[PDB]
Each structure stands twice: as C-alpha cells, then as structure tokens.
C-alpha cells in the first residue's frame, strides 16, 4: 500500500480535502489506505469511502457507455480496444472495492448499520461488473449481486426503520438492479413502491434532520417509479 506509511487520521483528513477539491481518485486512494489500516470505519468514513468510489466508477461507467454506443454503431480495432481498456480499468476498480469489502470490512462489521452498508456496496460493485460482463461469468456476477443485496435487505428490515437512509438507498439500488440487470422490471417496481410507501408512513416519527434525509431518497424512488410505470 502506497498509503501504508501515512497516519489513519491524516488519510481521513486528506480524503475530506480531496472531496472539497473534487479529486475523487485521490479521495478513493486515501480511503483505501484508511480501510487497510484494519480498524472499522465510522458512519462518516463509510460515506467517504462510498462517495469516492462511486464518483470514480461513475465516470468510468459513463465513459464505457459512450464508447459502447460508438462501438455498436460501428458494428478498425480502435473503438473496441479503447472500450476494452476503460472496461478493464472499471473492472479493476470494482475488484479493488470488492477486495476491501471481502478483506475484511464485511466480516469485521459488528453492527447491522455497518454490515448493511457494506453489503449494499458489494451488490453495487457486482452490479457494475454485471453491466460490462458478457457470458456465463455474467450470470454468476448477477446472482452474486442479488445475494449481496438480498442479505442486506434481510438485515435492514430486521434492524433499521423503513426511513433509514441506508435502508432506503439499498432498496433504491436493488430496485434498479432488478430493472436494468436482472430483467425483472416487475420486481423493481414492487420494491420501489413498497419501499416508498413504508417510508412515507414512517415520516411522522422523524425529526427535521432525519425527515430531510429520508425524503431525499424517496424522491429518487418516485423518479424511478415515474420512469417505469
């Protein structure tokens, strides 16, 4: 680890600086170093990890889609080669994240809160691998994403209220997985709708801070439901 000689606290601090500077690759490298210190991540630190890698892989996915569209229209080796290059880089980021989760964030997550957070991430990064996969490996990746998501759902329903923003974000993303990856649009609609309704019925228990948090994600659930119905 190139970050192995830096203090954990300094790495968290610099991750927060990288975020202010919109330096998300740096941010992710800092949080990888923090994770590799072997101590558990706080809620804020989990958000820093998730934000950094979501931005990094987000840009790679956007690039991959542009190139894949160009590739499909043109169907020399260049378009394919360059798509493959971005694809390989994207798969390596996903492998890096899944490696952190597997060694050893998930097993050391002794709370429902932290374990759900990491299990959702695991489903997300398998989902991103699924988006670019193209064979019998695609089916294994799809099932691995579903299993991770579903385990997070089971825990979240036992241990978190229906307005918890991590529970809500989990359901939002699992729903998109069903729609876009699993060819299960009915499942996607049913999950987003049930999640939205159960959250709405719980808003009356929330302080003003929590209300803002939950309603932000409810908005995204409705946006997707409006696309799909």
């Amino acid at each position: 680890g190139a970050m192995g000689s830096m203090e954990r606290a300094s790495l968290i601090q610099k991750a927060k600086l990288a975020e202010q500077a919109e330096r998300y690759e740096d941010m992710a490298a800092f949080m990888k170093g923090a994770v590799e210190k072997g101590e558990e991540l706080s809620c804020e630190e989990r958000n820093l990890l998730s934000v950094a890698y979501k931005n990094v892989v987000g840009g790679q996915r956007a690039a991959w889609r542009v190139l894949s569209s160009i590739e499909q229209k043109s169907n020399g080796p260049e378009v394919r080669e360059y798509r493959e290059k971005v694809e390989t880089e994207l798969q390596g980021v996903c492998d890096t994240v899944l490696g952190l989760l597997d060694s050893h964030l998930i097993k050391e997550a002794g709370d429902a809160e932290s374990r759900v957070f990491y299990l959702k991430m695991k489903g997300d990064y398998y989902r991103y691998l699924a988006e670019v996969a193209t064979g019998d490996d695609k089916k294994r990746i799809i099932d691995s994403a579903r299993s991770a998501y579903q385990e997070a759902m089971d825990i979240s329903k036992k241990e978190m209220p229906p307005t918890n923003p991590i529970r809500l974000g989990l359901a939002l993303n699992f729903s998109v997985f069903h729609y876009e990856i699993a060819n299960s649009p009915e499942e996607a609609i049913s999950l987003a709708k049930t999640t939205f309704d159960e959250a709405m019925a719980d808003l009356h228990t929330l302080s003003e801070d929590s209300y803002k948090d939950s309603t932000l994600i409810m908005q995204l659930l409705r946006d997707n439901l409006t696309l799909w119905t």
Binding site: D124, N173, V176, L220
Partner: peptide
Amino acid sequence: FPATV
C-alpha cells in the same frame, strides 16, 4: 438512466 445512491 435511473437514480442510484
């Protein structure tokens, strides 16, 4: 594209 968080 649909929203994810």
